[PDB]
Amino acid sequence: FERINDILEHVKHFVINLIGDFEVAEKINAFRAKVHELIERYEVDQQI
Amino acid sequence: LGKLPQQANDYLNSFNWERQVSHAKEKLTALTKKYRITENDIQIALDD
């Protein structure tokens, strides 16, 4: 199973790299930046 | 009888827009720091 183990390791590494390339924390950070920008644009402090 | 308007004004000016802006800034700081998924921890967990 040396070849089987090597192929499994390669597949696992490819899956890990794909997940690292397609992350969700970057999307969450971008969304939080958008929310902060919208809050600053609406200027809640001036309204209150 | 005269203390009631004075107490009402003290309540109004104590909880003025200063506290509102302070709490808004606290919430923004928590969102920008505490409410952020650190990709560093994600990558450390993936590598481990």
From Swiss-Prot, chain B:
<protein>
    <recommendedName>
        <fullName>Apolipoprotein B-48</fullName>
    </recommendedName>
</protein>
